[PDB]
Amino acid sequence: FMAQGTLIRVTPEQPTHAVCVLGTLTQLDICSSAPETSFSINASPGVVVDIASTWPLDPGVEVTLTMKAASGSTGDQKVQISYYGPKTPPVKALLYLTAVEISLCADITRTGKVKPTRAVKDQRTWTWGPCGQGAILLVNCDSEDLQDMSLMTLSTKTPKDFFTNHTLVLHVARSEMDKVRVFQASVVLGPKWPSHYLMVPGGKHNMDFYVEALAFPDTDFPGLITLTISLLDTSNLELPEAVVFQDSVVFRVAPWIMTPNTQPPQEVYACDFLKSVTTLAMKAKCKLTICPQDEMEIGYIQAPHKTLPVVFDSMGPDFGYVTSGLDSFGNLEVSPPVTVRGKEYPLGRILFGDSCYPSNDSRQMHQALQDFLSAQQVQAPVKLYSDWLSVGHVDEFLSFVPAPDRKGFRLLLASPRSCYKLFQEQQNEGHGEALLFKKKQQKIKNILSNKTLREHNSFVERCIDWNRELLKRELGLAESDIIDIPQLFKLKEFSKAEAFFPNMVNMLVLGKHLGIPKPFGPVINGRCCLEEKVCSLLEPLGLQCTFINDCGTNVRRKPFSFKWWNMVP
Ligand SMILES: N[C@H](C(=O)N1CCCC1)C1CCN(c2nccc3c(-c4ncc(Cl)cc4Cl)cccc23)CC1
Ligand SMILES: [Ca+2]
């Protein structure tokens, strides 16, 4: 609550006239310029004097002043210092104080409700987590347009004639200058004005500022912006302006957060089988639009006062937009809230594809995408191995669905051996002539006999196995949280993998209703074994399995109730 101020050096010769800012301790320099033994001090009834009624001239006397109420006029409040001694008659040092109030209120407590600066301890350092301090900013991503902006106010109670000899200046550091825009009740601090002179009148006067952030956190911007108020002494026309008081709030720009398959959906977008999508969406109770691809992704940015969705593209609604094969949002899945060896990741962890080691022929996601994901912190990315895939996307062999038990979810992984065992269970029963089914059909007896297909699917198993162990470690996962979806592959151009039949992990999870790509499996006794196997896997967790066909569609899911600012990266 109690902030630190300047030192006021009084002298027995002339009197001293200082200003003191309500909420700041002020130190008094009695020992300098004093003559010669002991000293008393008596002040005006609105000046609190802590010493640490008679005291000596030892230089170890911390004389500290604080003001009790803002002033009516200049030198409203007086302070007098005695410098008596044993044989010396008391010598007076005068000090005339002028109380003022200068407070920056802004939402530093992250409760939605703007609070004054003297309400935190360290107003100048932004800290994560609950019990933390630091106001939030939303990026622009594009009256009532104040809604997507932060509130910052200045409340000042000063004498009538105060700003004749003082002035207030609002200012932002030049390095943060191009990343913020501050409006007055009109742009004051901007991307080319690092400081602006407030015209404030005497007396009591609250004036309001609106702050938007102009860019997201990144390797050239850790995400902090501090706006600072400075009180300037422009009295003595000869000498320059002397600062007498500075105070500031620190904003952190809200990062972009991504949503996992396990968040409740809100809207489905799409621009034939669109009937079967509308049907799934009807059953899941969720909105759906049509405009007459997965090169975008719909996240959200969140501050106490306003949450809104934002779309990133590598026009549509979603009130906000921002703009090799591995560089696609198909190569970005987001885990559910998890805790690994005690560390909580309550907004998930972002999984993206990559090679295992860099070579000539190895691909990687562009370094500036990886660095931007990482720069948001809140969802500590996790590099995976997917370069073995023709396309390269993580979405090609993993997905998450909601479960009512264990950790509340399951990780689906594609599994060639899961499919082989099913086909072998089928052939062992005399169904090797069951034809599977991008056209040439094959009976399962041929497919299991294909020794080459066996090697591809063994190697592919080793790839997905490698990633399995990665997910286990980086997501603190127990096998009991993993469900292997039978799925075949084939190695095509440049010995990269391709989904043998429709990639069933690449599914639409709309709450508990799954739209799964129809594999066109071998029909055994009027029931496709592959569908039957996947229902058998997912229905115990109470998912509703529906098999479709095959631009695509996207999904906007409800943001986490957990507020990113309470995590501690
Ligand atoms: N200064 C700008 C800013 O903050 N603005 C612009 C005006 C509004 C606010 C930054 C925006 C973010 N921007 C990006 N940096 C990395 C990646 C990006 C991706 C992406 N593309 C593909 C994948 Cl798979 C993953 C990702 Cl995140 C999409 C879209 C933008 C991106 C860096 C410049
Ligand atoms: Ca994805």
Curated annotation (Swiss-Prot):
UniProt GO MF annotations: calcium ion binding; histone arginine deiminase activity; histone H3R17 arginine deiminase activity; histone H3R2 arginine deiminase activity; histone H3R26 arginine deiminase activity; histone H3R8 arginine deiminase activity; identical protein binding; protein-arginine deiminase activity
Active site, UniProt feature: 294, 393, 395, 551
Main localization of the protein described in the UniProt heading: cytoplasm
Compartments where found: Cytoplasm; Nucleus; Cytoplasmic granule
Keywords: Calcium, Chromatin regulator, Citrullination, Cytoplasm, Hydrolase, Immunity, Innate immunity, Metal-binding, Nucleus, Transcription, Transcription regulation
Modified residues (Citrulline): 174, 181
EC identifiers of the protein: 3.5.3.15
Binding site for Ca(2+) 4: 293, 297, 329, 332-333
GO biological-process terms attached to the record: chromatin organization; chromatin remodeling; innate immune response; nucleosome assembly; post-translational protein modification; protein modification process; stem cell population maintenance
Cofactor binding summary note: Binds 5 Ca(2+) ions per subunit.
Tissue: Expressed in eosinophils and neutrophils, not expressed in peripheral monocytes or lymphocytes.
Reaction catalysis annotation: L-arginyl-[protein] + H2O = L-citrullyl-[protein] + NH4(+)
Stated pH dependence: Optimum pH is 6.5-9.0.
Residues binding Ca(2+) 2: 142, 148, 318
Principal EC category: hydrolase
Similarity field: Belongs to the protein arginine deiminase family.
Involvement in disorder: Rheumatoid arthritis: An inflammatory disease with autoimmune features and a complex genetic component. It primarily affects the joints and is characterized by inflammatory changes in the synovial membranes and articular structures, widespread fibrinoid degeneration of the collagen fibers in mesenchymal tissues, and by atrophy and rarefaction of bony structures.
Protein name: Protein-arginine deiminase type-4
Gene for this chain: PADI4
